[PDB]
Amino acid sequence: MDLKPDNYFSGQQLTLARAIENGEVDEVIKLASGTDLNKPGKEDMTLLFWAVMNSINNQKTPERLNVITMLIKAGADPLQPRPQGKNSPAEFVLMADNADWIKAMLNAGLSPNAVDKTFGKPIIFQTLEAKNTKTLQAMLDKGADINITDSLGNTLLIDALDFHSYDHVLLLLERGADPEIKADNGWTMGNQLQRFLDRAKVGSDEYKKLNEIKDVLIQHGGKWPPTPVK
Amino acid sequence: HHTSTKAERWQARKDLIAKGSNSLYPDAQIAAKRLAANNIAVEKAKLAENVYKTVNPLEATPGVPEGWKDISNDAGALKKYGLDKEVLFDHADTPDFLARVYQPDSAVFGSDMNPTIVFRGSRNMADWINNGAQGLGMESDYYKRAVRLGSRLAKSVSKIDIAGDRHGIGQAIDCIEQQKDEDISIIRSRA
């Protein structure tokens, strides 16, 4: 509900956590230079996750978003993993339905092609689980490689179609993502799209969206029908 | 409780199945058919049980059923199926979607079993993440990572099967084992 900073921090980290709680940008800038920004408090809480938690709902204000920026500028690591394969603040806010929080991190100069420190996967892949394309748009607008690949050669376009993240697929195609890239297994996005199209029920909402993807693919110059997998 | 190795018991169970399938008696013949199917199904249900023992997904899961190896933390082995560790679980909180991948030992199972991916069933100061996820508009949808894995496995060149609450799985294993004991009795009755 209403979080209390004393449940997670003590000492100088608590003094900074209270400045964050109060949304006091100048006090945050003053204190962040002398505080250990990355040592976690209790319950896996870090000072940067605390800043995210203090910038949501009625606290999603320009100053409280800028607190995130200023903590990263001071040395708080936006790619710090949590234990047990849990994700960093940058990956976490890429899952949001609004890009304000990732933009506050990009405003501190986080690379849009950054990879996560546990799995080595480009953090932009985490946008595919968001309920709309706003966080992917923010990453692409800041200059991310639209054709970046994971360790198995999958692109955002390939992974988004597999995820059934069809609005991400459409956005990637409209922004000029290369649909002809083959993953290590030799598949293109289009190879899967053809499988999906062939099994879809005529007139279902899935059928309608997959055909829209096919039309947009062609409209942006993609090869159709696809070359069969070798 | 068990005198022989898993491999020896697996072979001896197939030997008994073969004896039933060769019987003139129709009850022994159908008992052998069901026994063969349940012998396979109980191994899958034991893996389905095993995923509920995973705590840290980046660490070993204890009590992997004999004759199987957990490859969920072996990037090289997963690559064979087009998988990596990252896609096997959710990462914002304690995992809701979690899968584990197991390879059968051919020394035990020969070619009877395939690599198998098993999906686990979906499930105040420490709940700060769930607060954050709600204010951030997080979808929090178990199905997304499950469908994604289904889409990927359709491209796998190497054969891989899909399988997979904890109490219900245990009861299921009870019912399967009970059926096995009944079919073994029928078969032995016709010798």
Author numbering:
A (entry chain A): 1 to 230
B (entry chain B): 168 to 290, 299 to 339, 446 to 472
From the manuscript:
Fo-Fc difference maps show continuous electron density between these sidechains, suggesting that the residues are covalently linked. MODIC density is also apparent in the crystal structure of chymotrypsin digested lipase•∆ss-Tli complex. In the latter structure, chymotrypsin has removed the entire catalytic core of the lipase domain (His340 - Leu445), yet helix α13 remains tethered to α1 via MODIC. Thus, AGE crosslinking joins the N- and C-termini of the lipase domain into a topological circle. This intramolecular crosslink explains increased gel mobility because the lipase cannot be denatured into a fully extended polypeptide and therefore adopts a more compact hydrodynamic radius during electrophoresis.
Here, we show that AGE crosslinking is harnessed to activate an antibacterial phospholipase effector protein deployed by the type VI secretion system of Enterobacter cloacae. Endogenous methylglyoxal reacts with a specific arginine-lysine pair to tether the N- and C-terminal α-helices of the phospholipase domain. Substitutions at these positions abrogate both crosslinking and toxic phospholipase activity, but in vitro enzyme function can be restored with an engineered disulfide that covalently links the N- and C-termini. Thus, AGE crosslinking serves as a bona fide post-translation modification to stabilize phospholipase structure.
